[PDB]
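Re: ODX structure - here you go.
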Amino acid sequence: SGFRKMAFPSGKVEGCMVQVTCGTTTLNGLWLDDVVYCPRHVICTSEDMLNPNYEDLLIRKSNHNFLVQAGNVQLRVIGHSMQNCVLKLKVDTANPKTPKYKFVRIQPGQTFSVLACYNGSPSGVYQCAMRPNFTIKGSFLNGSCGSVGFNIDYDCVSFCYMHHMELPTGVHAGTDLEGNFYGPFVDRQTAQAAGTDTTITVNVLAWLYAAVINGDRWFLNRFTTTLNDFNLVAMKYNYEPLTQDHVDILGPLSAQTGIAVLDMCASLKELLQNGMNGRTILGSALLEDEFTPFDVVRQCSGVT
Amino acid sequence: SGFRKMAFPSGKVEGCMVQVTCGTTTLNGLWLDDVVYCPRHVICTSEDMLNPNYEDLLIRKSNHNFLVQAGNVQLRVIGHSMQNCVLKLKVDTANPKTPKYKFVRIQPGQTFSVLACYNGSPSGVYQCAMRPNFTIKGSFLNGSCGSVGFNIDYDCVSFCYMHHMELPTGVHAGTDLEGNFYGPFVDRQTAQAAGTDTTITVNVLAWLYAAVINGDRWFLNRFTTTLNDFNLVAMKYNYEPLTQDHVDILGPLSAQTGIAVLDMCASLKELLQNGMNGRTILGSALLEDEFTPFDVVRQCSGVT
Ligand SMILES: Cc1ccncc1NC(=O)Cc1cc(Cl)cc(N[C@H]2CCC[C@@H]2O)c1
Ligand SMILES: Cc1ccncc1NC(=O)Cc1cc(Cl)cc(N[C@H]2CCC[C@@H]2O)c1
């Protein structure tokens, strides 16, 4: 029992972290096979960030301008290319610690672990979610760019995020490993507001199922609802609309607890309308939405 | 910016996890040098857990009864001994992945990361604190015993916890790496109630400083207080008394923000007396107490 915001073990990703320096800028790179992936803004000076023409800036850079260090050893750069907002630095040595990996682009509402790094060295690991407005709420300081987000399925690391930016609002933006930003964000120092940060309803429900599994049952009521009735309340509270696909996804949790999905929806509807009344659920005073139904099943079953 | 419940990178500890089986019982062990450390209840059957005489049970066990597997390879056990509530299994091979390490016994209020494991394999990593009643609020299922808690200082892993038990109340109990339980807990299936779980005041204050650093400033007020006045309110709310040692420990955070410690105490006093009024601080609707002042400095400065 117990339910925690749990991150994946980070060892397989720690073995891929390198430091990339170009001119006066230093950030993190991800070394997989003989390629180092990093944010393309490594080639920019602070003055360049206002209105960068990355293709034009990159012309002035050669392979020897990209300093890649793995631990205390320098890697030799034998090629460089830009793919969307990431640079791919071909090095002469394959990473001996390359795990089995995939590059995946996640959907809003999906969770992943972040290994926050500085100068190619890991500082910590935490769990976060791709928000419905395509931002993430991480913990990143200057130098953290190039830190990656990932999920693990047994021995295969699926990299889904690379950190690029902090918006003026303190929220984070980045790309998948093909260099495409999540959301409408651009790697430029310009006015970029995030969009409405709605609550991931299906994740809230999964977390209520985790609460019942772990003994917190005070919020269970004598009511039921329908998807259309529940969604009228969800709209009012800036919650994402719940679909039959979401109900299907919650099926294993509903089976394990014997609580029908629409009954749990009625419990969530009352929590939205009435509040917690100073009570907590799994040590939280707000409804948690950064656990997917798969995260709950995984944590409650002990998948390694 | 951003502030997350961050765990240490787990790679150095993943390299130490092994599976230990004795008879029908399987749990986790920690392999450091040529010794594997595990909970002594690995020698018990479920019937033995009611009233175990560990010295008597251990007599019936020989080195060949302890099956230690690291990955898919079996380790040869050449000695066994019991130290308090842990067994030390001497193996014929030093762990090649042994990091620089120390065994430390932590004080209540201190935080650490847990690498939850099953069958010697890591499932996840999360951050937790030794509660003032010497329990931890983790996420552990059957088979998680022997999972360890640790802190890292650059390249040295300080192991502080080994998981042994879940109490009937869903809280967790365990030992340091010398086998001494934290708190009054015993490795027996008997009535054991935890004690009052008070709030770690100094950690709450550190987290309020992290909030101000990260822009959440709504709770700052025009007041101040004294240690004695603050503690009258802290007692009423089951908060640990704040001492001058704690004020000294918060010194760097007070210097960084320009907010005197007693002024922050007055803000916390108003939050206790008035509540949050439906507002949040760093994405939380309750006062968070599992970040030490050192955790806040570390996360806000990017220590790797
Ligand atoms: C600072 C940070 C914090 C967290 N995560 C990430 C970061 N870093 C960034 O966003 C990188 C970045 C991206 C853009 Cl579009 C512009 C800049 N401009 C810089 C010129 C002087 C300082 C200012 O940061 C930098
Ligand atoms: C189960 C668990 C969950 C989380 N963390 C840890 C655990 N495991 C434990 O506490 C181990 C343990 C310690 C004591 Cl003192 C007694 C037992 N008795 C068992 C006999 C039948 C089943 C029951 O669990 C087992």
